[PDB]
């Protein structure tokens, strides 16, 4: 299971996202509205941008069904998963319009770049490596942290987090791998960019926790 | 009305095609089969690199918006069109496998080049006017010859047309016309995409009718 | 520098397309003086369209070479392309009476599109080894028709039909065609899995040939 | 022109970078060869990737002589500065083998997954945009502390500036910023990839004095 070796490298960068003060504190309910407003601002940024990756992704993918994957889920995003970020947008008391206006940070800007750039000249499954990170790491947070929702008693905090502990976000995460496995590609010519977005995602969380 | 302007310009060829012997003769129910099941071969294939086209289009729209319309006139294409294919492949005795192996025409590569290479290089907007040939073409198509279908004896034939005589697929060519109206830009620049669309709409068919 | 293996495949199996381009009457009448100036004026106006699509095909090539080295000759055929490649045929033009102008000006044909636009497609979203299969009949063909028909030459009386063909008999032009199979032959990509594009493009330059024959 | 605005608007991460320390002391012959040596592994990645960058650019040119000049940059990048670069690593011992080999820092990749991304997705004159500062800034880095020289006893600084100082190094800026001035473009619409490309600039010499 190659993403299992990928997953196993990354351990040291991983356990410093999956120990994170701005995950612990979102998960408990001690992590104050500000730093949330604004991670949230950085968010639309995030997910437009990663909705283009999958595009590009999905542009060239070897096969049918392959492309059929990326180009769902690359329709879940600006559908899907938008829905849920404007109604959590209004819940906080923010609107599309704002995080349209939102600012994207550094580690925004640097790592949605890297995201796109690699999906518009890679291999499939190599942009589909550096893509993985991001819904497994959000994955394996809810797994961990998922447990002190119930003291939790923030109501937005803990509807963000039901998304990642969902059998049907877990059962997206499970396809991801089942398709860099069944790919027939070597883990240490995958790595590079599995690490790179793991950074990403480490540096990320640290950037919203700053609020800079 | 750009739109509008881009068909009136463009009727030379597409009155060609709207009398178009292939056409005619499979509203009619004069198409041989073979003639039919080697369209369909084409067309599969024709299909997949048109999802690409539109992950390319959506991959790049200067807004979050125009990008949902790509993708979700990209995705509809996969639900709509691509699943009536699947099930019109069965009913005449072929498969996805034979689809897959079966050989792409000159006019098909061509076609799906000329597609893939524009919604690459050129602006989102003049991609779009590069696709509209296809869909709205086929929907008139079905306008004129739609009325034919009663008389057509042949089921697998009434089942290909009944897509495009139905309001979701027209409903699917109504947006890309308002992307198209909304845009900005003149009808004699955006035409030279237009045509040439056009143009291999007309020739695809005449492959199909040949057999080369 | 030099090849052995899966370019000499591609080309094998591509003998039916590319025996029909050897002997094409373009070609030949080109080689013999025979061919009406007024169709190899109309072949030069189309060579505008070509060759700037095929240097940005080759750009595209570039930007994803899987080493520098690899990236470095992509790029140094696509500059050639537009500088060394354009000198000569703005200088072929100007001896017929045309300019870069009327050439920039002219309306490229289908099948010159349809090609450009195959090259363009490939190169912007295939692999590298791949792109390069999908340019590699252009340089090979022309060296082998010059192969084939060089010797008919010495006996050809249109001054410019010769010095358009002798840029493919040079032993510069030879030279190149092998670097670009040493490239593919050394990839480790298989014949089966790099036809298509080898192919296609075979394909394309037959054609590019007839429609110039026909004058559309 | 367009391009004079981008500078003024610019002018508070610019003024930054013209005295940046690095910069200050490396012209003055002050900055300890170390932090050269690094910043000259750095630079390799910097000029493989912007040779790609400018290989994307010239990919999508709106006229043929605009393409030329991408080209030729693209080429000259990897033919003439490669020819400067190595000759540079051979006077401080180090070979184009160490730079290959050397590890691109964060700022690095960041910065050339920006142009990459940008160049393989955005508009021709957007790249060019971002493309700029790299060009015009060190020229004017070397118009601030070109008079330092004099009095610099490092032969190998000096040569590299002198560069920067040539008159054909400035004439290339000029033809740089005449390709966007003549653009027909606006400066408000133009200036978010001459501002990220200034920010990334400014990252990579602070980078490169702090030698991580």
Same mark, same amino acid.
């Given at each position: 299971?190659?993403?299992?070796?990928?997953? /196993?490298? $990354?351990?040291?960068?991983?356990? /410093?996202?999956?120990?994170?003060?701005?995950?612990?504190?979102?998960?408990?309910?001690?992590?104050?509205?500000?730093?949330?407003?604004?991670?949230?601002?950085?968010?639309?940024?995030?997910? #437009?941008?990663?909705?283009?990756?999958?595009?590009?992704?999905?542009? /060239? $993918?070897?096969?049918?069904? %392959?492309?059929?994957? $990326?180009?769902?889920?690359?329709?879940?995003?600006?559908?899907?998963?938008?829905?849920? =970020?404007?109604?959590?947008?209004?819940?906080?008391?923010?609107?599309?319009?704002?995080?349209?206006?939102?600012?994207?940070?550094? #580690?925004?800007?640097?790592?949605?770049?890297?995201?796109?750039?690699?999906?518009?000249?890679?291999?499939?499954?190599?942009?589909?490596?550096?893509?993985?990170?991001?819904?497994?790491?959000? $994955?394996?947070?809810?797994? !961990?942290?998922?447990?002190?929702?119930?003291?939790?008693?923030?109501?937005?905090?803990?509807?963000?987090?039901? #998304?990642?502990?969902?059998?049907?976000?877990?059962?997206?995460?499970?396809?991801? !791998?089942? #398709?860099?496995?069944?790919?027939?590609?070597?883990?240490?010519?995958?790595?590079?960019?599995?690490?790179?977005?793991?950074?990403?995602? %480490?540096?990320?969380?640290?950037?919203? =926790?700053?609020?800079?």
């Amino acid at each position: 299971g190659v993403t299992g070796e990928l997953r /196993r490298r $990354a351990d040291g960068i991983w356990q /410093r996202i999956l120990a994170h003060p701005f995950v612990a504190e979102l998960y408990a309910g001690t992590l104050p509205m500000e730093k949330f407003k604004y991670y949230l601002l950085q968010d639309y940024n995030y997910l #437009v941008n990663f909705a283009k990756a999958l595009s590009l992704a999905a542009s /060239r $993918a070897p096969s049918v069904d %392959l492309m059929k994957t $990326a180009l769902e889920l690359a329709y879940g995003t600006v559908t899907g998963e938008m829905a849920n =970020y404007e109604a959590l947008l209004k819940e906080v008391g923010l609107s599309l319009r704002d995080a349209a206006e939102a600012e994207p940070n550094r #580690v925004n800007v640097s790592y949605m770049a890297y995201l796109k750039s690699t999906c518009a000249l890679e291999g499939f499954y190599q942009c589909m490596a550096a893509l993985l990170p991001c819904f497994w790491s959000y $994955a394996e947070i809810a797994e !961990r942290h998922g447990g002190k929702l119930r003291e939790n008693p923030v109501h937005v905090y803990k509807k963000w987090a039901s #998304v990642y502990l969902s059998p049907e976000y877990r059962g997206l995460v499970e396809r991801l !791998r089942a #398709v860099l496995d069944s790919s027939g590609l070597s883990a240490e010519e995958l790595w590079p960019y599995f690490k790179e977005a793991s950074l990403y995602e %480490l540096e990320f969380w640290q950037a919203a =926790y700053e609020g800079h």
